[PDB]
């Protein structure tokens, strides 16, 4: 997989588009922005109106555009947090119940899972050989070749591609600020415009 379509970073960065989160899919504890581009972790009395169209198991929100085509970049800040869940999803996926976070359920994404542990969620997961920790991680979808890529946008380098997807349908981009990890990890994710 010689992955000759993926740019590298100053490239991918080319492709920027304007992304905001989704507050009605969201899981209902999350907070949100009034610009809608930062979301975290409220407490269990801080709930969304409730509708059955959210995420009621897995911490997670959509976003907006979604998108049939084309090259599509956006960049997160994920800063000093111990835990989060960035990439892109069918929009079809299941919202309800324990989610399975997998290319073969309509998921490419990766997960910081803890102080120096990130993976892609391949199955069986693959670890990610990160040695120098993001504060800023960017996402890049080529539809066409079928490939979605990750930067560390704080070290100027690659991540990792998830390579010969098989995307159908719309795609959107999907968050998740991770769990409250004692205090840990309370933080937002903020998506931000390109530095």
């Given at each position: 997989m010689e992955m000759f379509n993926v740019p590298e970073l100053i490239g991918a960065q080319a492709h920027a588009v304007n992304v905001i989160l989704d507050a009605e899919t969201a899981y209902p504890n999350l907070i949100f922005s009034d610009d809608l581009k930062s979301v975290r972790l409220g407490n269990?009395?801080?709930?969304?109106?409730?509708?059955?169209?959210?995420?009621?198991?897995?911490i997670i929100v959509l976003g907006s555009?979604?998108?049939?085509?084309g090259r599509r970049y956006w960049e997160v800040e994920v800063g000093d947090k111990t835990a989060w869940i960035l990439g892109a999803c069918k929009?079809?996926?299941?919202?309800?119940?324990?989610?399975?976070?997998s290319p073969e359920n309509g998921y490419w994404v990766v997960i910081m899972?803890?102080?120096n542990e990130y993976q892609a969620s391949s199955v069986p997961p693959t670890r990610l050989l990160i040695k120098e920790p993001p504060k800023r991680v960017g996402i890049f979808v080529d539809y066409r070749v079928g490939s979605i890529s990750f930067y560390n946008v704080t070290a100027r380098s690659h991540i990792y591609t998830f390579a010969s997807c098989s995307f159908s349908g719309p795609l959107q981009p999907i968050f998740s600020p991770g769990t409250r990890d004692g205090g840990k990890n309370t933080a937002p994710l903020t998506i931000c415009p390109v530095g």
């Open positions: 269990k009395w801080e709930r969304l109106p409730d509708g059955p169209q959210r995420f009621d198991s897995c555009p979604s998108f049939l085509s929009t079809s996926i299941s919202r309800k119940g324990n989610l399975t976070l899972m803890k102080e």
